[PDB]
Amino acid sequence: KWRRPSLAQQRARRAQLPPAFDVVHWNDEDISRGHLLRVLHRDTFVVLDYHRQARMLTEEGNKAERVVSVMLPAVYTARFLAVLEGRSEKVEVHSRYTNATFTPNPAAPYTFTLKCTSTRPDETFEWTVEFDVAESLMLQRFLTQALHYNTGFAR
């Protein structure tokens, strides 16, 4: 009948924060090429938070720093799912801040690629996130849950 301090604390954290999963691509060998994409669900939007690796994993401080955040309206969920499920060969997202595509990666079955060119007041930042077999499956289940909940099936 223990008393768990942290266990109680992280329980509430997980519950309050947005449902999400992380696509981690660290690279201490070369910090400039390491990145983190956190995929979350907040206020009916699927949010893609792209981060660059800050410092090597072998040191204090936050290992990542958020560089750009793309918010995808609910209508894009089914279009991304269509690519993950093999019905569509591509989905394009166009905004005055984002121009991105999500497509299958020829290199291996069941793998996909997110390529994006972001812009802000005139600044521009190009980034790519590869999804291997596991990461793609994670995105397909995540989007499946987001569509299920956003549709109202858990009310």
């Binding site: 089914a78 019905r87 299920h148």
Partner: protein, 146 residues
């Protein structure tokens, strides 16, 4: 408010515009469609409705029909035909998505008419996910355990 998705297809020639709704109440799927009412709206101040409820089509399916529709999505059966006093409909998977068609009658208008609606591309994915979700939530586990 029931779980649902809607396809808004507003046209220039209103004669061909429709709003199609797919909703579920527990075990029962409610598929409805509203013909466009008038030209495409433009003025944000115009609070009139874009579609016509008085001329809507509204069909109710049984719990087993929801399971047959999922079976067509999963390709366990090529198609499913449903017949009641109110309608005769066939649901089949096409190369581009799904096709629901047959004879129905609009509200308060005893008079059959040919009708067809397709759910293609991303709309096919939307329908697939909605039917699978609906079937899984149709037994009452979530509410019972809550």
């Amino acid at each position: 408010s029931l779980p649902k998705f809607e396809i808004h297809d507003v046209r220039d020639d209103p004669a061909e515009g429709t709003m199609t709704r797919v909703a579920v109440d527990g075990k029962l799927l409610l598929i409805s469609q509203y013909p466009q009412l008038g030209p495409r709206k433009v003025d944000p101040n115009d609070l009139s409705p874009q579609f016509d409820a008085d001329r809507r089509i509204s069909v109710r399916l049984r719990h087993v029909d929801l399971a047959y529709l999922v079976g067509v999505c999963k390709e366990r059966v090529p198609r499913h035909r449903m017949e009641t006093k109110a309608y005769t409909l066939d649901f089949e998977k096409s190369a581009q998505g799904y096709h629901l068609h047959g004879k129905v009658h609009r509200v308060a208008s005893q008079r059959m008419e040919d009708w067809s609606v397709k759910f293609d591309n991303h709309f096919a994915v939307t329908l697939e996910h909605f039917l699978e979700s609906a079937l899984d939530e149709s037994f009452g586990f979530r509410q019972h355990y809550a």
